[model samples]
Target: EVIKKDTPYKKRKFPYKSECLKACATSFTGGDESRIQEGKPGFFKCTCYFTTG
Candidate 1:
């Protein structure tokens, strides 16, 4: 649920993780939930994908 500015993605709208997640569905894909804590944000290969155009 991470959203960027209108046309320009340079600026992010939501700074909080919870807020960004709210924009997407509540479903964890790829690996287990514990794996997220081991790696950096946006580093792991996630199966969840969202679109907004």
Candidate 2:
């Protein structure tokens, strides 16, 4: 459990993690944690509301 201040991450390719959490939940209209790996093997999710505070 980390991330209190850090931002900017995205990359997409899926066949796992449930379509990479719906491919960033229909491409980042909101955050959807794509089960962690940090893209290219990670479907990242964490779009900040109040910028992830």
Candidate 3:
């Protein structure tokens, strides 16, 4: 049998310091199986979320 339990939510910041850096930011967080997506942001603010299981 197998079971999964989620951990607490965490966050990260991706700043748009430059064009290249901005491009590096992805549309999702926590790798391929991430549940959270891009959240509210300002001109130079990008947030990412992660919940591990």
Candidate 4:
């Protein structure tokens, strides 16, 4: 016999600086770190703030 524990409302982990540096810039020309998408963890989304291009 085996027992299992399920956790749905788990605490989200914060984004690492390195992650933002790569994704933020890659996703857009001047991508900026905003926050998790629609409260989804690990789904960070950002906006572009381009100037002098």
**Per-model tally of clashing residue pairs:** 0, 1, 0, 0
Q: How close is candidate 2 to the true structure, as a TM-score?
A: 0.17
TM-score to true structure, per model: 0.23, 0.17, 0.22, 0.25
Q: All models: lDDT?
A: 0.30, 0.37, 0.35, 0.33
Considering TM-score, which of the candidate structures 2 and 4 is the better prediction for this target? Answer: 4
Query: What C-alpha lDDT, on a 0 to 100 scale, does residue 22 get in candidate 2?
Result: 42
lDDT tens string, model 1, 2-49? 333211122255344443342233344464332232221221122223
Clash pairs, model 1 backbone:
none
Candidate 3 wrong stretches, greater than 4 Å: 1-31, 34-40
Candidate 3 on 1-53: residue-level lDDT in tens? 22222222223344433432233234324665344322333344333333434
Give the distance in Å from residue 51's predicted Cα in candidate 2 to where it truly belongs: 7.2
Report lDDT (Cα) of residue 10, candidate 2: 51
Candidate with maximal lDDT: 2
Query: Residue 38's C-alpha lDDT in candidate 3?
Result: 24
- Name the regions of candidate 4 deviating beyond 4 angstroms: 1-14, 28-48
CA RMSD of each candidate after superposition:
11.6, 10.1, 10.1, 15.6
